[PDB]
Design an enzyme around this catalytic site. Structure first.
Site, PDB file in Angstrom:
ATOM      1  N   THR A 260       8.709   5.604  -6.474  1.00  0.00           N
ATOM      2  CA  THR A 260       7.763   5.683  -5.108  1.00  0.00           C
ATOM      3  C   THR A 260       8.769   6.091  -3.727  1.00  0.00           C
ATOM      4  O   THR A 260       8.405   7.272  -2.909  1.00  0.00           O
ATOM      5  CB  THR A 260       7.176   4.544  -4.600  1.00  0.00           C
TER       6      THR A 260
ATOM      7  N   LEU B 247       0.522  -1.190   0.008  1.00  0.00           N
ATOM      8  CA  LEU B 247       0.027   0.090  -0.033  1.00  0.00           C
ATOM      9  C   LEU B 247       0.934   1.267   0.076  1.00  0.00           C
ATOM     10  O   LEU B 247       1.725   1.354   1.037  1.00  0.00           O
ATOM     11  CB  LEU B 247      -0.883   0.114   1.154  1.00  0.00           C
TER      12      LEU B 247
ATOM     13  N   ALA C 275       4.546  -2.388  11.107  1.00  0.00           N
ATOM     14  CA  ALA C 275       3.617  -3.359  11.809  1.00  0.00           C
ATOM     15  C   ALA C 275       3.464  -4.543  10.706  1.00  0.00           C
ATOM     16  O   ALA C 275       3.575  -5.560  11.072  1.00  0.00           O
ATOM     17  CB  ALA C 275       2.268  -2.667  12.176  1.00  0.00           C
TER      18      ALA C 275
ATOM     19  N   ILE D 299      15.423   1.579  -1.952  1.00  0.00           N
ATOM     20  CA  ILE D 299      15.742   1.157  -3.307  1.00  0.00           C
ATOM     21  C   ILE D 299      15.110   2.510  -4.030  1.00  0.00           C
ATOM     22  O   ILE D 299      14.122   3.086  -3.740  1.00  0.00           O
ATOM     23  CB  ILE D 299      14.876   0.123  -3.615  1.00  0.00           C
TER      24      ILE D 299
ATOM     25  N   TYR E  30       2.999   0.626   8.140  1.00  0.00           N
ATOM     26  CA  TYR E  30       3.893  -0.252   7.273  1.00  0.00           C
ATOM     27  C   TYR E  30       4.588  -1.297   7.839  1.00  0.00           C
ATOM     28  O   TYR E  30       4.572  -2.372   7.612  1.00  0.00           O
ATOM     29  CB  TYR E  30       4.658   0.717   6.301  1.00  0.00           C
TER      30      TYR E  30
HETATM   31  N1  LIG Z   1      11.404   1.018  -2.895  1.00  0.00           N
HETATM   32  C1  LIG Z   1      11.957   0.850  -1.375  1.00  0.00           C
HETATM   33  O1  LIG Z   1      12.816   1.758  -1.052  1.00  0.00           O
HETATM   34  C2  LIG Z   1      11.644  -0.366  -0.765  1.00  0.00           C
HETATM   35  C3  LIG Z   1      12.218  -0.488   0.413  1.00  0.00           C
HETATM   36  C4  LIG Z   1      11.978  -1.436   1.250  1.00  0.00           C
HETATM   37  C5  LIG Z   1      10.980  -2.448   0.823  1.00  0.00           C
HETATM   38  N2  LIG Z   1      10.486  -2.341  -0.393  1.00  0.00           N
HETATM   39  C6  LIG Z   1       9.401  -3.059  -0.793  1.00  0.00           C
HETATM   40  O2  LIG Z   1       9.526  -3.687  -2.053  1.00  0.00           O
HETATM   41  C7  LIG Z   1       8.194  -3.809  -2.728  1.00  0.00           C
HETATM   42  C8  LIG Z   1       8.078  -2.819  -3.842  1.00  0.00           C
HETATM   43  O3  LIG Z   1       8.215  -1.361  -3.489  1.00  0.00           O
HETATM   44  P1  LIG Z   1       8.352  -0.350  -4.760  1.00  0.00           P
HETATM   45  O4  LIG Z   1       9.088   0.724  -4.493  1.00  0.00           O
HETATM   46  O5  LIG Z   1       8.480  -1.313  -6.102  1.00  0.00           O
HETATM   47  O6  LIG Z   1       6.777   0.070  -4.798  1.00  0.00           O
HETATM   48  P2  LIG Z   1       5.941   0.778  -6.013  1.00  0.00           P
HETATM   49  O7  LIG Z   1       6.653   1.082  -7.042  1.00  0.00           O
HETATM   50  O8  LIG Z   1       5.056   1.778  -4.924  1.00  0.00           O
HETATM   51  O9  LIG Z   1       5.073  -0.375  -6.393  1.00  0.00           O
HETATM   52  C9  LIG Z   1       4.019  -0.976  -5.731  1.00  0.00           C
HETATM   53  C10 LIG Z   1       3.210  -1.794  -6.762  1.00  0.00           C
HETATM   54  O10 LIG Z   1       1.926  -2.555  -5.984  1.00  0.00           O
HETATM   55  C11 LIG Z   1       0.719  -2.318  -6.193  1.00  0.00           C
HETATM   56  N3  LIG Z   1      -0.092  -1.880  -5.588  1.00  0.00           N
HETATM   57  C12 LIG Z   1      -0.462  -0.715  -4.714  1.00  0.00           C
HETATM   58  N4  LIG Z   1      -1.570  -0.679  -3.922  1.00  0.00           N
HETATM   59  C13 LIG Z   1      -1.972  -1.780  -4.565  1.00  0.00           C
HETATM   60  C14 LIG Z   1      -3.403  -2.572  -3.997  1.00  0.00           C
HETATM   61  N5  LIG Z   1      -4.159  -2.088  -3.320  1.00  0.00           N
HETATM   62  N6  LIG Z   1      -3.391  -3.847  -4.596  1.00  0.00           N
HETATM   63  C15 LIG Z   1      -2.769  -4.623  -5.379  1.00  0.00           C
HETATM   64  N7  LIG Z   1      -1.602  -3.971  -5.729  1.00  0.00           N
HETATM   65  C16 LIG Z   1      -1.237  -2.475  -5.220  1.00  0.00           C
HETATM   66  C17 LIG Z   1       1.107  -1.288  -7.299  1.00  0.00           C
HETATM   67  O11 LIG Z   1       0.215  -0.904  -8.490  1.00  0.00           O
HETATM   68  P3  LIG Z   1      -1.243  -0.037  -8.325  1.00  0.00           P
HETATM   69  O12 LIG Z   1      -0.962   1.294  -7.635  1.00  0.00           O
HETATM   70  O13 LIG Z   1      -1.515   0.068  -9.861  1.00  0.00           O
HETATM   71  O14 LIG Z   1      -2.142  -1.210  -7.764  1.00  0.00           O
HETATM   72  C18 LIG Z   1       2.251  -1.169  -7.683  1.00  0.00           C
HETATM   73  O15 LIG Z   1       2.676  -2.353  -8.970  1.00  0.00           O
HETATM   74  C19 LIG Z   1       7.225  -3.212  -1.679  1.00  0.00           C
HETATM   75  O16 LIG Z   1       6.622  -4.510  -0.913  1.00  0.00           O
HETATM   76  C20 LIG Z   1       7.985  -2.465  -0.501  1.00  0.00           C
HETATM   77  O17 LIG Z   1       7.387  -2.661   0.978  1.00  0.00           O
HETATM   78  C21 LIG Z   1      10.562  -1.231  -1.124  1.00  0.00           C
HETATM   79  C1  LIG Z   2      12.883   5.282   5.443  1.00  0.00           C
HETATM   80  C2  LIG Z   2      12.967   3.595   5.757  1.00  0.00           C
HETATM   81  N1  LIG Z   2      13.460   2.994   4.684  1.00  0.00           N
HETATM   82  C3  LIG Z   2      15.009   2.590   4.643  1.00  0.00           C
HETATM   83  C4  LIG Z   2      14.829   1.384   3.664  1.00  0.00           C
HETATM   84  C5  LIG Z   2      13.755   0.433   4.224  1.00  0.00           C
HETATM   85  C6  LIG Z   2      12.896   1.544   4.680  1.00  0.00           C
HETATM   86  C7  LIG Z   2      11.382   1.359   3.982  1.00  0.00           C
HETATM   87  O1  LIG Z   2      10.866   0.260   3.838  1.00  0.00           O
HETATM   88  N2  LIG Z   2      11.088   2.598   3.205  1.00  0.00           N
HETATM   89  C8  LIG Z   2       9.679   2.260   2.737  1.00  0.00           C
HETATM   90  C9  LIG Z   2       9.042   3.863   2.901  1.00  0.00           C
HETATM   91  C10 LIG Z   2       9.807   4.931   2.088  1.00  0.00           C
HETATM   92  C11 LIG Z   2       9.917   4.349   0.693  1.00  0.00           C
HETATM   93  C12 LIG Z   2       8.896   4.405  -0.033  1.00  0.00           C
HETATM   94  C13 LIG Z   2       7.786   3.316   0.710  1.00  0.00           C
HETATM   95  C14 LIG Z   2       7.470   3.687   1.991  1.00  0.00           C
HETATM   96  C15 LIG Z   2       8.410   2.009   0.764  1.00  0.00           C
HETATM   97  C16 LIG Z   2       9.618   2.047   1.650  1.00  0.00           C
HETATM   98  C17 LIG Z   2      10.417   2.998   0.775  1.00  0.00           C
END
Ligand SMILES: NC(=O)c1ccc[n+]([C@@H]2O[C@H](COP(=O)([O-])OP(=O)(O)OC[C@H]3O[C@@H](n4cnc5c(N)ncnc54)[C@H](OP(=O)(O)O)[C@@H]3O)[C@@H](O)[C@H]2O)c1
Ligand SMILES: CCN1CCC[C@@H]1C(=O)N[C@H]1[C@@H]2C[C@H]3C[C@@H](C2)C[C@@H]1C3
Ligand SMILES: NC(=O)c1ccc[n+]([C@@H]2O[C@H](COP(=O)([O-])OP(=O)(O)OC[C@H]3O[C@@H](n4cnc5c(N)ncnc54)[C@H](OP(=O)(O)O)[C@@H]3O)[C@@H](O)[C@H]2O)c1
Ligand SMILES: NC(=O)c1ccc[n+]([C@@H]2O[C@H](COP(=O)([O-])OP(=O)(O)OC[C@H]3O[C@@H](n4cnc5c(N)ncnc54)[C@H](OP(=O)(O)O)[C@@H]3O)[C@@H](O)[C@H]2O)c1
Ligand SMILES: NC(=O)c1ccc[n+]([C@@H]2O[C@H](COP(=O)([O-])OP(=O)(O)OC[C@H]3O[C@@H](n4cnc5c(N)ncnc54)[C@H](OP(=O)(O)O)[C@@H]3O)[C@@H](O)[C@H]2O)c1
Ligand SMILES: CCN1CCC[C@@H]1C(=O)N[C@H]1[C@@H]2C[C@H]3C[C@@H](C2)C[C@@H]1C3
Ligand SMILES: CCN1CCC[C@@H]1C(=O)N[C@H]1[C@@H]2C[C@H]3C[C@@H](C2)C[C@@H]1C3
Ligand SMILES: CCN1CCC[C@@H]1C(=O)N[C@H]1[C@@H]2C[C@H]3C[C@@H](C2)C[C@@H]1C3
EC number: 1.1.1.146
Lengths: 263, 263, 263, 263
Positions: free
Chosen positions: B197, B97, B160, B193, B158
């Site tokens: 987003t 989310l 949690a 990453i 998040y």
């Molecule tokens: N980016 C980071 O720095 C980071 C760090 C730590 C962990 N992560 C994790 O890595 C994963 C990917 O993150 P990201 O940065 O690639 O996310 P992102 O670019 O925001 O992409 C999120 C994806 O999830 C979908 N989504 C959002 N709401 C949804 C819903 N209600 N139902 C179905 N799909 C939904 C989206 O499409 P729609 O909006 O079109 O549904 C989109 O494809 C996430 O689990 C996240 O917690 C990311």
């Molecule tokens: C600041 C904590 N960051 C440091 C790396 C792990 C963590 C996090 O998961 N960020 C979340 C937060 C910021 C970004 C956009 C979404 C909400 C998903 C993550 C990346």
């Protein structure tokens, strides 16, 4: 260092207080001269806890029966409890949904119900409580488990709910520290305690020693009153250090320096 | 040692695959010659991804659009994805989310929606997929975060939900190990990453370094195909040891003596 | 799993064998039907131990008397002992210099003598035994202490020498693994044991609880025979993990890749 | 917070000061206005350091040439250096015996000589300095290595001697704390440092990057002036956490409570 005088005249809510640890909590609070309001589903059981609290010398004692499965009950419970006591100094979140030990095989409803009862309700309670807690610079006890820090086979739903409490409440604590909000949050990490529920549910399966519930209840009060981040009651003096996770503590302190606190 | 041939002709779901890491995961699987079914809410964005996957060399590529807030969709999505491919070898649970970095001000509805989209749906999809995955001796990638091992201010809802994933899926893995179930479960721990987003959501708030999304995606695939318990991608060779929690590993190991396994 | 059959007919040196843990080690080996050569300085005490070993079932038993302060005695001792038994399978290095518990006050001569007796002799003995030990693919037990892993007031000279033992013998083990030398090295980390020397020395000074010498001796034998890197006997199931230092294990693992092994 | 005036007019001994880190330490003290006495065996190199220290602004600078293999020299050196400066505020023990990297194959004299130079001489120097340091409430820097905390192949004799330093000096510190003796002891844990000796010895064998000697010397001076128990100068921000050994800190704390301190 703890003195029982620290709870004299304090206004304290105890959930899951019809039996087990929560009942023992109420009893100790009563002996310390606190105002208590107790809750659980069983009216019958709660009347009896209230009578005994009075006899032990509580400043006052009242019950309100309902299910913490019902988010509206949780919200209205806190408003009525604060009305009965004229405020709130300490919120003790001790209730939990009973779940039999089994290998997980698709019981999605229990995963849902466990999260509602063990987690979402704790958050609802705390939100409803937060204005009165800010007013009195009070405290929340979040009763969790060794299984909310490590995993154990046969209790996946329960453990997920307890992990979630750590993620939520420790985050909230950090925010309160930065924002200079003087509401303490104590996560209570318990080992196997000799309540009835525990002893029956583990019979023949889990062979660890169990610690006494009366002692367990006292330590929950003591740690929360001393405004500890964490309180460990687990049957060994060594285990708290293995659960304390210094690496996490380090990463949290260092990551905090990466925020733009001016913005 | 990973070989891209390990994914040739394999049947793979990717959630959250319209953009970010998910999209990157889909592209890599395409280059390796996998069958893919991608999902997210946005039908237009998924179509772009699917056409690109075909061009990149996917054996097959389809999309199904919907919201993972709806547990009925989640259940039906898997059965349909499985019919489209004639089975399932790997389930990548990557969706999350959208949230913003803001102090918790009692936003209960957001706690509830976060827990639904980020946690409960992962469980629901896993349970729907489990028959197919036992048949193929397949794998599940659970995409989490450093924030699902330590806490960070401004993201309590998040964190949690991410902690909740660890308690649930890690427990499941342990039960699968004792029961000789041939379905691996890889908890992916990501640092910051460089997805669109994350860059925008941290701008002016959180100033830590980010790692590249393309390599992040490839590491999820590799660690999952290699059936690792955990896969860390956090910008450091050192930090995974301060998140791995040696103390928890010791306690879980020692915990085996505490069950009556023959019973 | 250990079986006492693993020591039957094995050729074993035991140092500091005239009383305490060393004496008990000798007895246990006798019962298992090892050949033993024992040593210390007290002739009469050694003659009594040898006789009892024979009564208990040793394949053979001999003593040689001398001081491990004397590096030429140490070397010649090893040669004679291998000559007596026609080989060597296990070297148990158990002797130590008697030391009372006082604050350090500049006793340089005692720092010297503690290093000679407790450390340098152990290296010289090992060096003398090494050809025989390589021929038998045998084992060394290096008897140390919790005080060879952490520090304690009042025993600085002793602790210095036990720390040296870990740095030396643990490097040697690392070199033997890398070079496929099949001589195992077991560092035994003992907590307080109820030997007469320890009871007297700690009386009214150090009041921690003591474990039984008989079992301690057996545990040294089993751990060494099982070819463990380390053997903890400290009266706690948990304490070994606060002593064995996961941080070190991680660092040693990671550093091994910093070597140019081809060269 | 360190300030360089902390050392203006202070009286400092630097051993191994003819080259490498010890030379850089002498130079930094000179810049800060300290009185220095430097030692090593090489007369002609020590002459150059003394002239350069005077150029950089040293309140005074002298040298005494001699081998720390000679315990009598060590004792006399200290008395003479204190005579020369009219007291002693800081004793920096930095010298070490150079030992070629090799697999250990029975070099007993190198084990002995390394323990004499690297360990025994540090103790003798400290005892000889102690009256002056008690009178000035001064400080001792005990220069060690990562290899005095963990083991590395090819340097067993060196590692044994650095481990010994930790056991001895960390014990003395804990006694000084209890006896309220205001002489601080700083164990300096250094990674690979770019002295000519290290870079040549490791060339083609150990491939880890080396940190700058100039900065290493400053950090030793700072941590010692600040009366820190340990100072790490190592290559990675994470390594001081891994070498910090919280398990040892905990055990030392809880053990200390088992003493009868009245007696
Ligand atoms: N980016 C980071 O720095 C980071 C760090 C730590 C962990 N992560 C994790 O890595 C994963 C990917 O993150 P990201 O940065 O690639 O996310 P992102 O670019 O925001 O992409 C999120 C994806 O999830 C979908 N989504 C959002 N709401 C949804 C819903 N209600 N139902 C179905 N799909 C939904 C989206 O499409 P729609 O909006 O079109 O549904 C989109 O494809 C996430 O689990 C996240 O917690 C990311
Ligand atoms: C600041 C904590 N960051 C440091 C790396 C792990 C963590 C996090 O998961 N960020 C979340 C937060 C910021 C970004 C956009 C979404 C909400 C998903 C993550 C990346
Ligand atoms: N016992 C242990 O070994 C152990 C170990 C680790 C952690 N803990 C923790 O300690 C806390 C107390 O455990 P315990 O053994 O004392 O439990 P217990 O004896 O089972 O008591 C549970 C209490 O919670 C209530 N409760 C259950 N479902 C409820 C619902 N839907 N709504 C409102 N109240 C509900 C109960 O009353 P009604 O049934 O009348 O509602 C009862 O008062 C729990 O948070 C738990 O996870 C216990
Ligand atoms: N007991 C404990 O609580 C405890 C705690 C931790 C570690 N440990 C370790 O366990 C080992 C044995 O302890 P212990 O309590 O059994 O000791 P002990 O009862 O004092 O026995 C020590 C033995 O070593 C010999 N020895 C002493 N000085 C010697 C010398 N110069 N040359 C040759 N031999 C000498 C003694 O015999 P002679 O006097 O006949 O020479 C005696 O046989 C030691 O390595 C010790 O550090 C003991
Ligand atoms: N460089 C590194 O990577 C590194 C890493 C970890 C720890 N350290 C530590 O840092 C300290 C200095 O290392 P370094 O690299 O600077 O050493 P270095 O460049 O080899 O210099 C050693 C100094 O000690 C002296 N010395 C050697 N043998 C001596 C003897 N028998 N008696 C008196 N002095 C003697 C030398 O002078 P003479 O030959 O003229 O006597 C020289 O002044 C050492 O304690 C070492 O263990 C260094
Ligand atoms: C086996 C894991 N135990 C061992 C230590 C804590 C954890 C636990 O929370 N057990 C459950 C289980 C037994 C008890 C009563 C209910 C059912 C609630 C818990 C404690
Ligand atoms: C108090 C430190 N004890 C606590 C547990 C182990 C450490 C030890 O090495 N003691 C030695 C020392 C003093 C006592 C008599 C002998 C030499 C044998 C030990 C007990
Ligand atoms: C390989 C372990 N190194 C890597 C990091 C520090 C440690 C060390 O102290 N090496 C010894 C070795 C090489 C250098 C010069 C002498 C011989 C003194 C030390 C540094």
């Amino acid at each position: 260092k703890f003195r029982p005088e620290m709870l004299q005249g304090k206004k304290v809510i105890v959930t899951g207080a019809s039996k087990g640890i929560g009942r023992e909590i109420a009893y100790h609070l009563a002996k310390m001269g606190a105002h208590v309001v107790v809750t659980a589903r069983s009216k019958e059981a709660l009347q009896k806890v209230v009578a005994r609290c009075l006899e032990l010398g509580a400043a006052s004692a009242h019950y309100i029966a309902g299910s913490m499965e019902d988010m509206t009950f949780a919200e209205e419970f806190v408003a009525e409890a604060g009305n009965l006591m004229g405020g709130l100094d300490m919120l003790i979140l001790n209730h939990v949904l009973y779940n039999r030990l089994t290998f997980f095989h698709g019981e999605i409803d229990n995963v849902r119900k466990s999260m509602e009862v063990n987690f979402h309700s704790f958050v609802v309670l705390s939100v409803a409580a937060m204005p009165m807690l800010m007013q009195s610079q009070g405290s929340i006890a979040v009763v969790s488990s060794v299984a909310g820090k490590i995993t154990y086979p046969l209790i996946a739903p329960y453990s997920a709910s307890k992990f979630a409490l750590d993620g939520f409440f420790s985050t909230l604590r950090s925010e309160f520290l930065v924002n200079k909000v003087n509401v303490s949050i104590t996560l209570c990490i318990l080992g196997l305690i000799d309540t009835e529920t525990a002893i029956k549910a583990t019979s023949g399966i889990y062979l660890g020693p169990a610690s006494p519930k009366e002692e367990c209840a006292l330590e929950i009060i003591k740690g929360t009153a001393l405004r500890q981040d964490e309180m460990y009651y687990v049957g060994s003096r060594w285990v708290p250090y293995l659960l304390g996770n210094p690496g996490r503590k380090i990463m949290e302190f260092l990551s905090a320096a990466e925020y733009n606190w001016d913005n």
